[model samples]
Target: QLQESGGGLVQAGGSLRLSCAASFAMGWFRQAPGKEREFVASISRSGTLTRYADSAKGRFTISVDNAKNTVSLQMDNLNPDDTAVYYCAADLHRPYGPGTQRSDEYDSWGQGTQVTVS
Candidate 1:
C-alpha cells in the first residue's frame, strides 16, 4: 500500500520535504524531469538498509524512517528551477519514460504529488 500527502508549499530560496509510504515492498524510485528523483535510502522489514544514487545536491535526498513505515524526499532552495510534479514509482518491473527514449511511457506511475516554488 502507498499513502502520500501534498498540499504544501516551498517559498523561493526555501526548502520543502515530502514523504510517501510503501507498505508491501521496497523498490527503486524515479521522478519526472525538471524534476529529478533520488533513491535516497531504504530499510527492510528486518532492518536491513541501503542508499543509492546521489544523496543530495541542489535539491534531493531520500530518507527512510522504517519505524514509521515511510520514505521521504527532501528538497532544498526552492526556485523556478525546482518546480515540478513529484512521483514515487516502484522498480519492480521494467523502466520506460520520456528521457529513456522509450515509447512505452511509464509502466506504472504514482498518483503524483505536485509541488511548486514561488
Candidate 2:
C-alpha cells in the first residue's frame, strides 16, 4: 500500500520537496502535465544506490526514512522546466540483489505530486 502527499504552486528557482509513504520507494518519475512519464532517478534505501536519467547531468535527490517509513524527494535548484508531477514508485520484484534503474520495471506508482515551478 502507498499514499503520497505533496504538490503546490511555487516560484521558479526555489527549492522543491515532495513525499510519500510506502513499503519503499525505489524510483522517481515525472509527468509534465500533458507530457509522458519520465524517469528521473532511483536509489536504494537512502544513498546506497543512485541512478539519474540524465547520467550526464547531476540533479535532485530522494531520501527514505525508516523512522516514518516514508520517502521524500527534494531539489534546491529548481527551474521552470522542473514543473511537473513527481511520482514515487517501487519495484514489485527483482533479482536477489538490488535492481537496476529500469531492469525489473516499476510495479507501483504514487498518486503523484503535482509540482509547478512557475
Candidate 3:
C-alpha cells in the first residue's frame, strides 16, 4: 500500500510538490475533475529511468529515495487548470523471460491528494 500527501492549495503561478511512500516501484498519476486518470511518471527501486508523459515532460519531475522507499512528484508553474486529485500507484510487474516488465494493473494505490490552484 501507499500513502500520498501534499499541499491542498496553491496560488496561481506557484508550484506543487507531493510525496508518496511505498515499498515497491511506483508511479504518479492524476485525474482532473470529470477527466480520466493520466499517467505522469514512474521510478524504479534503484532509481532507474524515470519516464514521464509527453505532455508532462518538461513541467513534471519524478524522484526516488530508495532508502526511504518513497517517490515524489514536483509540478511547477501551477494554474487553476492544474487542479486535480493525484495518486501514487504501486507498479505491478511480472517476470517475462529474462526481465520483469510493468503491467497495466496498479495493484495498490495511495489515498489520493486533492490539489486546488487559484
Candidate whose TM-score is highest? 3
Q: In terms of TM-score, how similar is model 3 to the real structure?
A: 0.84
Q: Candidate 1: give the clashing pairs.
A: 40-62
Give the residue spans of candidate 1 off by over 4 A. Answer: 23-58, 93-108
Model-by-model lDDT, in order?
Answer: 0.50, 0.69, 0.74
Error (Å) of candidate 1 at residue 111 is 0.9
State the displacement of the C-alpha of residue 31, model 1, in Å, after optimal TM-score superposition: 6.7
Error of 1 at 66 (Å): 1.0
Off by over 4 Å in 3: 94-103
Q: Each candidate: how many clashes?
A: 1, 0, 0
Expressed as tens digits, the lDDT of each residue in 1-118 for candidate 1 is 4666552567888877777775232333435474446343332333344334443344555556768867666767667655666655443333221112221322444566767777
Clashes of 2: 0
Clashing pairs in 2: none
Model 2 agreement with the true structure over 1-118: per-residue lDDT tens digits: 6688876778876777778787333777887878777777766664466666772135577667768878777776677888888877877563222335663487787888788878
Answer with 1 or 3, whichever has the higher TM-score: 3
TM match of model 1 to true structure:
0.57
Ranking by TM-score: 3, 2, 1
